[PDB]
């Protein structure tokens, strides 16, 4: 099937760097520049081979047709109230971007409030963050072009959906919080830098500052509220307490779930928002996370992981702040992770737990912390919720592997709390009853039991004949919970596949201990867990090595690329989306410096020793055995991505093609598809989503020669 000669790619053999005595050659270092003629030519040559390969077999057309039909279903978000009006996002089915609607009453006629589709024909302009003023009469929203992390904040007066003149530039990784006096809004922005700032650049992002914009003025007049000149990596986000009296400043450095917490009592300020607010440094260290829930006077309720890896709720009284005085409102659960908490109807708390990778939802009393009501849920995830302190009702959205989901509503003013189905859509073309989801726990190399969900057609014989698609992430305290994916269901129904999701360490499924078990010196545990998931599927008869595909994106891209290098014999196909491949240089680009909390940094000798062992780019090696070659591989990235710079995938594919692609025994393709006007993933328009999944599954079908099941 090999009808491709890989492109000529210059090797700069002089690119040698000493890492604590260890010489490392980076012959494709020049691919770090996305604007050079050399890099542009590289991309062009790679796509010249990948595109015809992907578009050759008719199965892609069949898949695309099926995806376009099945993905075409109404997609609603929960309703949420702001002031006297209700809002909700809704995509009729195939619009590139979902639209924000507004209605003056729960039973009132809805109208378009903000339609991002008219901002760009290809849907490359997407909403990225928003914030309503406390009274709900004004609205701020961020817009990102082509998936870039850079944002432009614009404003509207809600009544009449009137566009305002206010425009904020240089916004990135920003908070958006209006002061309750309705005068203005807090946000973050970066100092003007040379070069481009459109998502194509790779410049490191440092010195983020907190500004305050007074509505009706030019951005040049904004107040520089907080800056940390001596700590270039710190990021300070602001939020207002529910009563509008306190500005709470959460300071983060890196990606660990920890933050400093400072507060400014506005009642004690005499000159409004300035650059010299009288901050009280309540929590002035990075030892734990303090997520504001609500306050009653000086008694503040926080969700925290302080001495509680599964999280708990504590009350800190600003008038008696010493730790020994804090009160535990809802103790840490022995196993269940408290994911998030919201305060609603003044004195109720909605707590969302993760129990064995499945969400639970319940209501507690704010004053006593007592359990008041359990909201019954089937196996799945809570992916949406609405209900602030002043609200008297909640909406929540549930989803699962086999169903698009349901939006529930509960009027909290009733003595008897009866949650009712508010919105339920069914995908015509998929019969959920034909499939089943099972959860198993498999032992990893060190004996740790790891959860894995497996979705497949009911009644199949576990004879190892089925193609399988195994997904994982493993990092950053992120829990990979059940989600509805039409694309994956098409693989099951029309390609006869088995879906599997492994909840490997590094994630947050079992709290901070689960996260810590897959980071820094322990990162290899992630890879071992994932390799063991594959071995389980094979041993139990769900699939066989030659029929097994693994997939991951970003930190998940790192996962699958590492697994390809470490156990090429275990996989038939590997699809890595926007992966972090150069573990020695990741921290030098854009926001990569923030990831050192999970990976470590090569500037440290101890960390380099961990990194060099698994860095994908530095572990490409011909398999020793003559009967073993690398699996078919497909790397996906845009030529410009500011979250995970493209150079990771570009250098990795150049290395794979040179070291492995040239070997006589390598017959499986090693390809990269480089896209345009797309970024990390957020805000990706529908048209692009359909194209991407069609490419992915077409590639799997061709490499494994899978016949389409109509």
- CA gap 481, 503 in Å, rounded: 8
- CA gap 237, 234 in Å, rounded: 10
DSSP conformation letters of 8-49? P----TT-EEEETTEEEE-TTGGGG-TTSHHHHHHHHHHHHH
Q: How many CA atoms lie within 13 A of 619 on its CB side?
A: 21
The method recorded for this entry reads X-ray
Q: How many CB atoms lie within 10 A of CB 81?
A: 19
Q: At what angle do helices 647-659 and 555-566 cross, to 10 degrees?
A: 10
Contact 652, 645 (CB under 8 A): no
Q: What is the DSSP letter of 383?
A: E
Tokens describing residue 515: 């996260």
- Residue 364, classed as helix, strand or coil, is strand
Q: Which sign, positive or negative, has the C-alpha torsion 72, 78, 79, 83?
A: negative
- CA gap 390, 348 in Å, rounded: 11
- Express the helix, strand and coil content of the chain in percent, nearest 5 each: 20, 35, 45
- Cα–Cα nearest to 138, from 179, 86, 182, 85: 182
Contact 315, 329 (CB under 8 A): yes
- CA gap 98, 384 in Å, rounded: 15
- Residue 353, classed as helix, strand or coil, is strand
In terms of DSSP bridges, do strands 632-638 and 670-675 run parallel, antiparallel, or are they unpaired? Answer: parallel
Torsion of CA 187, 117, 426, 509, to 10 degrees: -30
Task: Show the 3-state SS of 509-559.
Answer: CCCHHHHHCCCHHHCHHHHHHHHHHHHHHHHCCCCCHHHEEEEEECHHHHH
- Cα–Cα nearest to 450, from 462, 438, 442: 442
- Residue 164, classed as helix, strand or coil, is strand
Task: Show the 3-state SS of 71-130.
Answer: CCCCEECCCEEECCEEEEEEECCCCCCCEEEEECCCCCCCEEEECHHHHCCCCCEEEEEE
Beta bridge partners of 276: none
In terms of DSSP bridges, do strands 573-577 and 632-638 run parallel, antiparallel, or are they unpaired? Answer: parallel
Q: At what angle do helices 37-56 and 647-659 cross, to 10 degrees?
A: 70
Torsion of CA 439, 441, 444, 448, to 10 degrees: 130
In terms of DSSP bridges, do strands 548-553 and 573-577 run parallel, antiparallel, or are they unpaired? Answer: parallel
Beta bridge partners of 338: 353
Strands (E), 266-380: 280-283, 290-296, 299-304, 312-317, 327-330, 337-344, 348-355, 358-365, 371-375
Burial class (CB in 10 A: 0-12, 13-18, 19+), 111: exposed
In terms of DSSP bridges, do strands 22-25 and 548-553 run parallel, antiparallel, or are they unpaired? Answer: unpaired
Q: Which residues of 495-514 are buried (b: 16+ CB within 10 A; e: fewer)?
A: bbbbbbbbbbbbbbbbbbeb
Q: In what order do the strands lie in the sheet with 498-502?
A: 435-443, 449-457, 498-502, 468-471, 548-553, 573-577, 632-638, 670-675
Q: Report the CATH architecture of 1-73+427-710.
A: 3-Layer(aba) Sandwich (3.40)
- Residue 248, classed as helix, strand or coil, is strand
Q: How far is CA 559 from CA 19, 110, 507, 529, in A?
A: 23, 44, 12, 10
Q: How many CB atoms lie within 10 A of CB 306?
A: 18
- Resolution in angstroms comes to 1.4
Length of the chain: 710
**Residue indicated by tokens 């729960």:** 106
DSSP conformation letters of 120-160? -TTS-EEEEEEEE-TTSSEEEEEEEETT-S-EEEEEEETTT
- CA gap 210, 142 in Å, rounded: 16
C-alpha 348 chain-centroid distance:
29
- Residue 57, classed as helix, strand or coil, is coil
Q: How many CB atoms lie within 10 A of CB 521?
A: 11
Contact 314, 299 (CB under 8 A): no
**Residue indicated by tokens 């901070």:** 512
Q: What is the DSSP letter of 320?
A: B
Q: At what angle do helices 59-70 and 686-704 cross, to 10 degrees?
A: 140
Q: For domain 74-426, give the CATH number.
A: 2.130.10.120
- CA gap 544, 466 in Å, rounded: 7
- Residue 196, classed as helix, strand or coil, is coil
Domain residue ranges of the chain, discontinuous segments joined by +: 1-73+427-710, 74-426
- CA gap 643, 516 in Å, rounded: 23
């Amino acid at each position: 099937m090999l009808s491709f000669q890989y492109p000529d790619v210059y090797r700069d053999e002089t690119a040698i760097q000493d890492y604590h005595g260890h010489k490392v050659c980076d012959p494709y270092a020049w691919l770090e520049d996305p604007d050079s003629e050399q890099t542009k030519a590289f991309v062009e040559a790679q796509n010249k081979i990948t595109v015809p390969f992907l578009e050759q077999c008719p199965i892609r057309g069949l898949y695309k047709e099926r995806m376009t039909e099945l993905y075409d279903y109404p997609k609603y978000s929960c309703h949420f109230k702001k002031g006297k009006r209700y809002f909700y996002f809704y995509n009729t089915g195939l619009q590139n971007q979902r639209v924000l609607y507004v209605q003056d009453s729960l039973e009132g006629e809805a109208r378009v409030f903000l339609d991002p589709n008219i901002l760009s024909d290809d849907g490359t302009v997407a909403l990225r963050g928003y914030a309503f003023s406390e009274d709900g009469e004004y609205f701020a929203y961020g817009l990102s072009a082509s998936g870039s992390d850079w944002v432009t904040i614009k404003f509207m007066k809600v009544d009449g959906a009137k566009e305002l003149p206010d425009v904020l530039e240089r916004v990135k990784f920003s908070c958006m919080a209006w002061t309750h006096d309705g005068k203005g809004m807090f946000y973050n922005a970066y100092p003007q830098q040379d070069g481009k700032s459109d998502g194509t650049e790779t410049s490191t992002n440092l010195h983020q500052k907190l500004y305050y914009h007074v509505l009706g003025t030019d951005q040049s007049e904004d107040i520089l509220c907080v800056e940390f000149p001596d700590e270039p990596k710190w990021m300070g986000g602001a939020e207002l307490s529910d009563d509008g009296r306190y500005v709470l400043l959460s300071i983060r450095e890196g990606c660990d779930p920890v933050n400093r917490l400072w507060y400014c009592d506005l009642q004690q300020e005499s000159n409004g928002i300035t650059g010299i607010l009288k901050w009280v440094k309540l929590i002035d260290n990075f030892e734990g996370e303090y997520d504001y829930v609500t306050n009653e006077g000086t008694v503040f309720t926080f969700k925290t992981n302080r001495h509680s890896p599964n999280y708990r709720l504590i009350n800190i009284d600003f008038t008696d702040p010493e730790e020994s005085k804090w009160k535990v409102l809802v103790p840490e659960h022995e196993k269940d992770v408290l994911e998030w908490v919201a305060c609603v109807r003044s004195n109720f708390l909605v707590l969302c737990y993760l129990h064995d990778v499945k969400n639970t939802l319940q209501l507690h009393d704010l004053a006593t912390g007592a359990l008041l009501k359990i909201f019954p849920l089937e196996v799945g995830s809570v992916v949406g919720y609405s209900g602030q302190k002043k609200d008297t009702e909640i909406f929540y959205q549930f989803t699962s592997f086999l169903s698009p989901g349901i939006i529930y509503h509960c009027d909290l003013t009733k003595e008897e709390l009866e949650p009712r189905v508010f919105r339920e859509v069914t995908v015509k073309g998929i019969d959920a009853s034909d499939y089943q989801t099972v959860q198993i726990f498999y032992p990893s190399k060190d004996g740790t039991k790891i959860p894995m969900f497996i979705v497949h057609k009911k009644g199949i014989k576990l004879d190892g004949s089925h193609p399988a698609f195994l997904y994982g992430y493993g990092g950053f305290n992120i829990s990979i919970t059940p989600n509805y994916s039409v694309s994956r269901l098409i693989f099951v129904r029309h390609m006869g596949g088995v879906l599997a999701v492994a909840n490997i360490r590094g994630g947050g499924e079992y709290g901070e201990t689960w996260h810590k078990g897959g980071i820094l010196a322990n990162k290899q545990n992630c890879f071992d867990d994932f390799q063991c998931a594959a071995e389980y599927l094979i041993k139990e008869g769900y699939t066989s090595p030659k029929r097994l595909t693994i997939n991951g994106g970003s930190n998940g891209g790192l996962l699958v690329a590492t697994c390809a290098n470490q156990r090429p014999d275990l996989f038939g196909c590997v699809i890595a989306q926007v992966g972090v491949m150069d573990m020695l240089k990741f921290h030098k680009y854009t926001i990569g410096h923030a990831w050192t909390t999970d990976y470590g940094c090569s500037d440290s000798k101890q960390h380099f020793e961990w990194l060099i062992k698994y860095s994908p780019l530095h572990n490409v090696k011909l398999p020793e055995a003559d009967d073993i070659q690398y699996p078919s591989m497909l790397l996906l990235t845009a030529d410009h991505n500011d979250r995970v710079v493209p150079l990771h995938s570009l250098k990795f594919i150049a290395t794979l093609q040179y070291i492995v692609g040239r070997s006589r025994k390598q017959n499986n393709p090693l390809l990269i598809h480089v896209d345009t006007k797309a970024g990390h993933g957020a805000g990706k328009p529908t048209a692009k989503v359909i194209e991407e999944v069609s490419d992915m599954f077409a590639f799997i079908a061709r490499c494994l020669n899978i016949d389409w099941i109509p």
